[PDB]
Structures are given as C-alpha cells and as structure tokens.
C-alpha cells in the first residue's frame, strides 16, 4: 500500500547574505550547501520569498529568487534552507483549480490538500518504457488534422509570431481535441492578462474548467518563476497522466518568455552565452521541459504537449524556435503573411511539420488516402508558392499551365481549406473530402505524388 513518513527536519536560518544582484542572492557561509535546494528568504518587511540554489562553492550558495530580489537587505534578510528540491503537492483534486506561477492558488480555494510531494524536475523516463504514440487526435483544425496530424503523446508546438492568433488556435485545439475527455494543464508564462482571461473564458465556456488546472504566471508576475511554471505544470501533467491513468493535454504558452527568463537568470550568472545571448545549456533546459511528453508502457496515459511559442520577428533561425524544433516533434507554423491576408487559422503548412503523421496518418487508422492526400497537398502548395513568385517576378503570362493550375489551387486552398471559422469542428474525413475537392482541380495525370491505387479509387 501507500508509504509515507511523519518526519520533522529542522531548517537552518542564514542571516549571512553576502550580496544580491539581479535575480541572484549570494550567501556567505552556508553549512554543507545543497545544490538545487529550495530556500525561503524572509525579507525585512516580513514577506517570505522562495528561492532555488543554482550554484554552490565551499561555503557560498548563489540563490535565485523566484519572486524577485526587490527589497532584499543584505543585513536583515534571513535565508531558510529547507532541505529538498522544489516539490509540488499534487492531488487528484488539483483538477479544476487555478494556481499562480509559483504553484500557489489564485482562486479563493484553499491550499491543495497534498496527495504526494512530486519533485518538479521529474525523473527521466526509460526510453524502453516509452510507447510510440500511434493514436491520432482529431484536433478539428483542417490544416493540422489533414496535413500536420498530431498523435496522442506528441510534443508539437505552435510557432507563432507576436500578435498572431496562436491563443485562438490553441484554444480551438483544446476545445475540439478528441480522437479520430482530455484533461488539460495550462502554464501561462508572462502572457498578458487579456490572453490569460481569454484562455480561462474559453476553458469555462467549453466546460473544460471542471477538468483543467491552470498555472497562470502573468506579465505582472515576477520574471524568474517562469522557470518553475513549466516544471510545475508538467509535473502535474505527469502525475495525472501516469499515476491516475488519465489523458492530459498540456499547453505551455510563451516558451519564448520562458527562454527570456532563462536568459535573464543566465546573464546574471555571467555564464558563457550561446547565440543571441541565451545560455549554452538552453537546449538541455528546453529538452527537460519538452521531453516530458509521450505515453508509457505500463500506465495508460498521455501528455500531448502543445507549447505555444512566440518566435520573435517571425523567424525560425532564432534560438528559441530553433531548439524547440530540435527537441519537439515538428511544429505548427503560424504565418504573419497569411494572417494579414485574413486566413484563420493562419497556419503555413510549408514550415509546418508533424513527425508522427507518418505513423498516425491512415491505412486503417483514419483513412486509406490520408497520407497521399497530405503529401499531394503539401507538394502542390509548394508548387503554388513557386508559381506565385514566378508570376510576380516575370509576369503571370509566362507561367505554364501547371503553374496556373497551382495558383488556382493555392487560392482555393488558402481561401477554402485552411480558412475555417473558430468553433468549427470538421472531422478528418470532412477535411480529406475538402482536400479532394481541391485536388480534383488538377487532372489525374498531374497528381503524381498520389499512389495510383488510391488515385483511381478516390478521383
């Protein structure tokens, strides 16, 4: 059965703060400092701010303070060394609540009655114990479920620039993320109160607030607990999905703001910087965040991770989107140009990719023609973009018959297939039928990427 320990461990209070700068507090003469320990800085005003030991020396401990170092006095701040890494108290009753960045509740509810104290950093899942997820989720979005299909257990972000409706797309996916009963955990990371209220309103309207736990860290919230928010949200997701055999859909919005928090912390440590000033280990940090998805051999549960991401200047080469593409399994690319043209969702399926569509596509899973239809659509859309560039450069008359057909397909594809209203939930079969109605523009001879056994059966 369950095992637990009624144990009391007295905690050392250190008034020996050496210096404080940025988010870091340096202590002076800690006794046996413990790495990645959690400390409680008692300010002279009496307020208590949690911390986290980032680096230790013979007697020093460079504590990062989650709630900011404003007001910390080198002569009256007392640091209390708890004796263990940051552990969130989880429970099955945590569903349906709202928590701040540091895991404390926001709603008028009480402190979460603990069911287990899980370390937020988690533990590495044995790759031999991971099940390859081959059960597609029908997100309802045509440009996702038809060309960049998501499998239940896949960590696929939403690469969207600043000011694009990535919040609307993610809310839509959360609303209609059934299979071809998802519990949701949300980690707001410096999103403005408008975006957080929109997400909360959508989750309440769609009935999801009964089975979702939000970890709201607004832009007004301190900028260092953005490093605890993804870990808290993901250890809650791991708890629910694995140790309650539940299905979890984690939404880690503003991973760009998470990486900005890492940059702020790293730059105050004077560490050797990577590209754009981000820490060298930011690949490993983003990996520790993202890689907590996927199903497991024993426990019937899945964390379908959808970390919304704000690529600055709408660039993939930027370190945050680049490393997120390296770690995660494909990405959903939201295009500023398409949004300006007025399409919703403004998903550009050319940079978009889903690494598990190759397995969850079809041939008995969803439909026989799914994979070939998706490949044909992607190829003809690339041809359409090339034809549009050629027409813009050297005139539309010079375009060939194939190029003109590609332009017509591009127009009828952006304006009728990608374009779908919010709260529209076309099934994958309806999406494939619309795709075919697009592909019937071409003659059967110019559909080369379609396998003939499916072309002759669906054309």
């Amino acid at each position: 059965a369950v095992e637990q320990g009624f144990n009391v461990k007295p905690r050392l209070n250190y008034n020996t703060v050496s210096g404080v700068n940025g988010p870091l507090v340096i202590l002076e003469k800690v006794k046996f400092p413990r790495y990645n320990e959690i400390v409680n800085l008692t300010l002279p005003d009496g307020t208590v701010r949690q911390g986290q030991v980032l680096e230790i020396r013979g007697d020093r401990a460079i504590v990062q303070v989650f709630e900011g170092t404003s007001g910390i006095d080198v002569k009256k701040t007392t640091v209390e060394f708890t004796g263990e890494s940051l552990r969130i108290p989880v429970s099955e009753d945590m569903l349906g609540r709202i928590f701040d960045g540091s895991g404390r509740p926001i709603d008028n509810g009480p402190k979460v009655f603990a069911e287990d104290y899980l370390d937020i950093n988690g533990s590495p899942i044995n790759p031999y114990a991971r099940i390859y997820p081959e059960e597609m989720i029908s997100t309802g979005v045509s440009a996702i479920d038809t060309m960049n299909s998501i499998a239940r257990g896949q960590k696929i972000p939403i690469f969207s620039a600043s000011g694009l409706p990535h919040n609307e797309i993610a809310a839509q996916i959360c609303r209609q993320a059934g299979l071809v009963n998802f519990s949701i955990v949300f980690a707001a990371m410096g999103v403005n109160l408008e975006t957080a209220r929109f997400f909360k309103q959508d989750f309440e309207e769609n009935g999801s607030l009964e089975r979702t736990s939000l970890f709201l860290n607004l832009a007004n919230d301190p900028t260092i607990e953005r490093i605890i928010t993804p870990r808290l949200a993901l250890t809650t997701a791991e708890y629910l999905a694995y140790q309650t055999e539940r299905h979890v859909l984690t939404i880690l919005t503003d991973m760009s703001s998470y990486a900005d928090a890492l940059r702020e912390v790293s730059a105050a440590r004077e560490e050797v910087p990577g590209r754009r000033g981000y820490p060298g280990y930011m690949y490993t940090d983003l990996s520790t965040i993202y890689e907590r998805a996927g199903r497991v051999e024993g426990r019937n549960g899945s964390i379908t991770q959808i970390p919304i991401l704000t690529m600055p200047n709408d660039d993939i080469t930027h370190p945050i989107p680049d490393l997120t593409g390296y770690i995660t399994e494909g990405q959903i690319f939201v295009d500023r140009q398409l949004h300006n043209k007025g399409i919703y969702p403004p998903i550009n399926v050319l940079p978009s990719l889903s690494r598990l569509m190759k397995s969850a596509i079809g041939e008995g899973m969803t439909r026989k023609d799914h994979g070939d239809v998706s490949n044909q659509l992607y190829a003809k859309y690339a041809i359409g973009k090339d034809a549009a560039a050629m027409k813009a450069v050297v005139g539309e008359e010079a375009l060939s018959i194939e190029d003109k057909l590609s332009l017509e397909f591009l127009e009828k594809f952006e304006k009728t297939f990608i374009t779908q209203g919010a709260y529209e939930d076309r099934t994958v079969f309806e999406s494939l039928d619309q795709a075919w109605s697009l592909l019937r523009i071409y003659p059967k001879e110019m559909l080369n990427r379609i396998s003939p056994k499916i072309l002759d059966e669906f054309y």
């Binding site: 210096g19 404003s70 007001g71 910390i72 702020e264 730059a267 910087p273 200047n313 300006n340």
Partner: protein, 593 residues
C-alpha cells in the same frame, strides 16, 4: 550613512553600506543627489544616480532613506510638469531663480502652500475603511473637480477622526485611522512606490474605444480605453505628433504625458499649446492643461532618470484610474527607456542580451505595459477607471527589428506602425496600413453595434480596398498598368483617393486637427459608397475612362469632404454628408443614364 567608493557615469558603488535594500532610495553625494540601489556586494551597494554625477568625490556621504522610490499622489498633480524624479519644474525654477535644473534640488513633490476645499465623503466616524476607499473630494480645478481623496491602498482600519469640510493644506491631517490600537494619521497626499503597481479590485475587458480623433487610427486600428499601444517608426514619422494629438483631443478624462527621453522644445510646445486649447467635456470650455500632467525627462537630462520618469508617469496614471478616471498615459520615446537601461547595464558590466540591451528588458517592458487596463478601483464606492498606454517605441535606424520594438510588440495589443516613406511625402500620420494592426477590433463590436452599426463593415471593406490596391500597385510597378481591368483601375483610383484624402489627416490645421468618430464614419461611408457605386457603374457597362471625366465633380466633392470643420456640430456635418451622398448618387445616375 555610507560613503562613495567608486563613480563611473551614473553608477556610484558606495562602501560601508551594510543594511541597504534593493531598489532602496539613497541620497548620494553632498548635494543629496537622488539615487537607487540596484546591486549589493557585501558592504558596497551599487547606486544609480538620477542626477548629474559629475563632481562627485570618493568619501561623499550617501544617506539611506529607508524607502523605495516613492511618488507623492494627491491634489496638485494636475496642470503641472515634473522631472524624472517627482520634482515640479516650475517650483525648481522659482526656487533656483535660474533656467537650469540644479543638482540635488529637493522641492516638495506637491505644492504644500495651496489650500484645497476638502468635502468629506460618505464615510463617518467609526466606520471601517479599507484600502482605496474615498473619504473626501478636493476641488482641484474647474475640470478635474472632485479630486476624490483615496485612502492609501495598504492602509486599513476604522476611522477615529475625519476632518470637517473646509480648506486644508497637504500637510494638514484629514483623517486618522485606528488599526489594532495603533492610530495612523492620514493627509490629503500619500506616497507610493513607483515600481509596485497600485492594487485594483479586478481588471476588466476594455470595451470602449479611445477615440484618438485621427481618421486612420480610430477607423482602421482602434485603441480601447485600457489597451496597450505602440507606435514604432523612425525619426520624423510622427510618433510625437500622434501622441500630442491624442493627449489633446482624446476622450480620456485625465492624461499623464511622459516625455521619457524626448526633446525639450516638445515639452515647451505642450506647455504653451495645451492652455490654448479647450475640451468640450465637463459641460464647459475648460482648458486642456487643467487635465494633463507632464513628466519631462528630456534626452540630455540624466540617463538613469528616464526609468524614474516612466514609472512616475504610470503611477500617476494608476492613481487617477483608482480615482475613477479614464486615464491615458503617453510614454513618449519609450525606446529611450530601453537605451537608459542599456547604458546602466553597460556601466554595471552585466552580460548583454540581443543588441546591447540587458537580458531583463523584455520583462521590465512587459511589467510596465501590464499596468494598463480598465479595472474596478480598490474600495467603496464602486469605481471603474482605466489606463491606456500609448508609448512611442523609437527603433534604432528605422527598422522594426529593434529589440525594444519586438519586446513591445509581444505585449502591446495595438501596433500603429509608422512608415518613414509615407512620412517623407508629408502623408501624415503616415500609419503603415500594411503592417499596423489592432487586436481590439473584435472587442469593439459591442460598441460599434450600439453606435455607428456599419462602422466595422466599412472598416473591413476599406482594409480590403487598400490591400487589393497595394498588391495591384506592387504588380503594376514592374508589369505596367496596361493589363489592368476597369475594376482594377477603379480600385487603384479609389485607394489613391482614400490614402490622399481620408487616411491622411493634416494636423495643425483648422479643419482636420480633430476628425471625431461621427465625421470619420460619415467620410468613411462616403468613400466606400463612391467605390461601390463606381464599380456598379462600370459593371453596368459604362467605361471608366469616360466615367472619370463625368464624375470628377463627385470625386472632388468626396475628397473635399475632409474640409468640413467638425466644430459645425454633429447634426450639421452629418447633414452635409447626407447631401454629398445624395449628390454623388444623382451624379452617377446621370452619368450612367
């Protein structure tokens, strides 16, 4: 009291300072220069000084004040200009008898000598009074009358003695709260830490538009009362003029103009122009300057004081929101705040982020722009104020790829991107309609349905016309206008007319200084109707080449509709626009007959 140990520009590492807190305020130097602590290393606490550090000597005493950078709030805020730190420029000038800002002037933040007509609120003796409750209103001026005196947000307890109605100076006690046996005396003014946002009961969705009065702005990229706004653009694009034409004629009740790193003559222009303009609100022709306060930290004034000016401006705006006023804080040259942060970080030696800026610039800007937003005030009675932030990000070299511009676009809900190319041609306000956007268009449907029902339809229609003609002109510039159809030629001509007679708004002109919402809607209807009827006429078989000569009169009447002075009244200008629409319809009917 510590001692200076090292000075390098606007950083003063002061030794023998065990006990100073982060962001505490210190009085660095003999002249008592105002400084804030930003880094602590044992005894030595690195201080940034909001005053010219030249002349400082090692060993100059630095006094720890014991309180973070605090702005004094209360009556007398309105109709005054302030430095970065909360210092009145008028009082500084009259105290120094000179035209220079002396180093270390400590004039009181609010004029103590002036006596205000305090009239007590609903609160009586013995009633429990929580933070932010209103216990009296002072008559500030004819426009900001009933400057309702809030209780400090952190203060609570029961009233023991409330002052009767009369005249009181700020130093005079007005109310004494007993809380757990410790009586605290409250006056007309209360200090507040600028870094800490003022608490509110609950923020609200901003559903009412900040009518800038400029056609392009409030007809294509609306800003709501309580929405963050950004105006990127190179020098001469018109960010300052848009900010001034917003603070001159918006529907905001009170305005906190912040010249963070602006030009001195710009603030002088505001000081001489606002008293000469009158706001039709409050039922009288009261001057604008009675509702605007200014935080002038010009470009050459101390680098560190730019951050103080921004935070002081936003704190004043937050206070006037807690009072229940639709404030609209305007942070002129918000990129100068980013440059001040970069300079201070360079002095500190901190590792840079992208393009020299510190790693926390995005976080600071986000926490600053999150102060905006309509919100119910903290205490009884129920009050619904709003702070709208319209900050002019100034890109380095004119490219929007600046880190400050990106970190501002990531947080602001509106983006009034200016175009240098349109600015050069005097096409003003030079709003780049291609890249500019407003995320409040969906929110404003609930207001455009109540008033001007066809406004959103016209807005999307004109955006469609402008986008189509922009693409068509891009094609024509390389492929010639030979292949254009008659409908495409009409789109080109109509969008050229829109750009040259509707989107362009010649400020500093009698007619088009303030094109209000009703005149903007009528002009918008006239332009859209002209386009639609021209396209219908060409579809009926009439050639566009002949129709242009036939309807040049209608086209010039439409283009001259912007000359209808809004001062003639809503009924008069609406009647003139109805007559113009009738004349337009008759002219097209006669031409197509």
């Amino acid at each position: 009291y510590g001692a200076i140990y090292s000075v390098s520009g606007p950083v003063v590492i002061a030794e023998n300072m065990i006990g100073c807190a982060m962001y505490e305020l210190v009085k660095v130097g003999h002249d008592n220069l105002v400084g804030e602590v930003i880094r602590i290393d044992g005894d030595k606490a690195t201080i940034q000084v909001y005053e010219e550090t030249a002349g400082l000597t090692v060993g100059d005493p630095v006094l720890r004040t014991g309180k973070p950078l605090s702005v004094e709030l209360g009556p007398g805020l309105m109709e005054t200009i302030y430095d970065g730190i909360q210092r009145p420029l008028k009082a500084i000038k009259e105290e120094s008898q000179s035209i220079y800002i002396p180093r270390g002037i400590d004039t009181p933040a609010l004029d103590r000598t002036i006596k205000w007509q305090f009239t007590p609120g609903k609160f009586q003796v013995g009633d429990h009074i929580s933070g932010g409750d209103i216990y009296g209103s002072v008559f500030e001026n004819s426009l900001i009358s009933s400057h309702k005196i809030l209780l400090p947000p952190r203060s609570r307890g029961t009233i023991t003695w409330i002052a009767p109605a009369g005249e009181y100076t700020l130093d005079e006690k007005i109310l004494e709260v007993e809380f757990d046996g410790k009586k605290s005396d409250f006056t007309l003014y209360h200090t507040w830490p600028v870094r800490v946002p003022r608490p509110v009961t609950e923020k609200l969705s901003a559903d009412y538009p900040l009518l800038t009065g400029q056609r392009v702005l409030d007809a294509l990229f609306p800003c709501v009362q309580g929405g963050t706004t950004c105006i990127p653009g190179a020098f001469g694009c018109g960010k300052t003029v848009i900010s001034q034409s917003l603070s001159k004629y918006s529907n905001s009740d009170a305005i906190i103009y912040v010249g963070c790193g602006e030009r001195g003559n710009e603030m002088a222009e505001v000081l001489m122009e606002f008293p000469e303009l009158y706001t039709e609100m409050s039922g009288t022709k009261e001057p604008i300057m009675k509702r605007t306060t200014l935080v002038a930290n010009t470009s050459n004034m101390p680098v560190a004081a730019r951050e103080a000016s921004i935070y002081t401006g936003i704190t004043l705006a937050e206070y006037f929101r807690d009072q229940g006023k639709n404030v609209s804080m305007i942070a002129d040259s918000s990129s100068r705040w980013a440059e001040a942060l970069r300079e201070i970080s360079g002095r500190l030696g901190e590792m840079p982020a992208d393009q020299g800026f510190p790693a926390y610039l995005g976080a600071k800007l986000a926490s600053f722009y999150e102060r905006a937003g309509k919100a119910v005030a903290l205490g009884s009675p129920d009050r619904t104020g709003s702070v709208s932030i319209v900050a002019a990000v100034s890109p380095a070299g004119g490219d929007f790829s600046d880190p400050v511009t990106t970190a501002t676009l990531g947080i602001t809900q509106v983006f009034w991107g200016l175009d240098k190319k349109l600015a050069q041609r005097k096409h003003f306000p030079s709003i780049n309609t291609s890249v500019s956007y407003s995320k409040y268009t969906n929110v404003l449907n609930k207001f455009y349905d109540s008033n001007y029902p066809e406004f959103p339809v016209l807005r999307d229609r004109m955006k469609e016309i402008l986008s189509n003609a922009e693409e068509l002109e891009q094609v024509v510039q390389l492929v010639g206008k030979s292949a254009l159809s008659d409908s495409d030629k009409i789109t080109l001509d109509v969008a050229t007319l829109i750009k040259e007679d509707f989107l362009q708004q010649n400020g500093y002109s009698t007619y088009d200084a303030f094109c209000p919402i009703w005149k903007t809607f009528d002009m918008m209807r006239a332009f859209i109707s002209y386009h639609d009827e021209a396209q219908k006429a060409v579809a009926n078989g009439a050639n566009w080449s002949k129709l242009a000569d036939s309807t040049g009169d209608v086209k010039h009447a439409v283009s001259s509709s912007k000359f209808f002075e809004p001062s003639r009244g809503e009924k008069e200008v609406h009647g003139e626009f109805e007559k113009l629409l009738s004349t337009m319809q008759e002219r097209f009917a006669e031409s197509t007959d």
